């Protein structure tokens, strides 16, 4: 048997205690942005950290369940808030849960068919994500987006589809949040 | 197959509410034989039969690979001396975990195994406790305020209440000048 545990959760950093962190800057995320120069400017200019994660996963078995705490740090990339490079599970069946902490923004969800859909998150939002949808969260305020995000543990990983193929829309700024289709 | 639409609900920091979730209630009458002290129980069931605990749900189908989640608000009080709880169970489909999140409040979590080793986790604003597979858990409030918490729980995962109906946890948790843990008398 796994031995029960306690972690303590920080609301104002997103930090979890013993959760094994990860960093993402702009340049770990080539080829994300539509806005290719205005990347390429940014990284130049010390690529700054788009979102940082704090994790607590088990081992990949059926039933099982990982947790983690997501900071997107506001910015835009070009017109193109900061955003997760997101993802499909290996095993699409799996759905998640989301639950805004801090800040302000949205999520991104795609279908294989082709249904794209963005929901808005504040504090207190609890997003449901079905099996089978791809998704992205967005932060589109100028402060720190901070979520708490709850998966299968055998959900695992699939980035190449939206490494090539991608979501079917963009998330910029235009005076105002503005979801428009992608090339 | 249609592809189920994905959404945003709001939850309440402050109430636990979470909208457009189905509630359930349960009250002292609602949990027979399950405190020790059966004369403070009967006792407070006429003077009152308040509500010991109440819980926001939004349940998908049994099926593998999908997430339900929910919040209760677990109300202060003690039956005699023990701190009121939730019913506790194990999953039906046993290696199922779960996952909880504590948001207002104070209390703790009881678990056991199917042996009944036992552990009690402390639980405040901020904590997440993990509940791994095989274990059986029971929320405590141990405060004087409502302690308020959200649970994220496989959708497969499925309720045993039977097993704790009739043997109950091999702890009981009470006040006695302090918060103390000890056996269950009839365990
Ligand atoms: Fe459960």
Avoid: C
């Avoid at 088990?58 to 193109?80: C, M």
């Avoid at 998640?96 to 068919?113: D, H, I, N, R, S």
């Avoid at 829309?169 to 992608?182: A, L, Q, R, S």
């Amino acid at each position: 048997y796994k031995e029960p545990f306690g972690v303590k959760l920080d609301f104002e950093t997103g930090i979890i205690e013993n959760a094994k962190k990860s960093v993402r800057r702009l340049s770990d995320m080539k080829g994300y942005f539509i806005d290719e120069e205005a990347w390429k400017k940014m990284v130049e200019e010390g690529d700054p950290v788009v979102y940082e994660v704090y994790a607590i996963e088990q081992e990949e078995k059926e039933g099982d369940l990982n947790f983690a705490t997501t900071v997107l740090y506001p910015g835009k990339v070009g017109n193109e808030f900061f955003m997760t490079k997101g993802h499909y599970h290996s095993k699409i069946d799996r759905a998640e849960v989301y639950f805004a902490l801090k800040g302000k923004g949205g999520m991104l969800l795609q279908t294989p068919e082709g249904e794209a859909r963005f929901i808005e998150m504040e504090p207190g939002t609890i997003v449901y994500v079905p099996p089978y949808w791809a998704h992205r969260t967005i932060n589109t305020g100028d402060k720190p987006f901070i979520f708490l995000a709850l998966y299968p543990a055998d959900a695992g990983h699939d980035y190449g589809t939206i490494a090539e193929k991608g979501f079917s829309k963009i998330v910029v700024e235009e005076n105002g949040k503005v979801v428009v289709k992608d090339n």
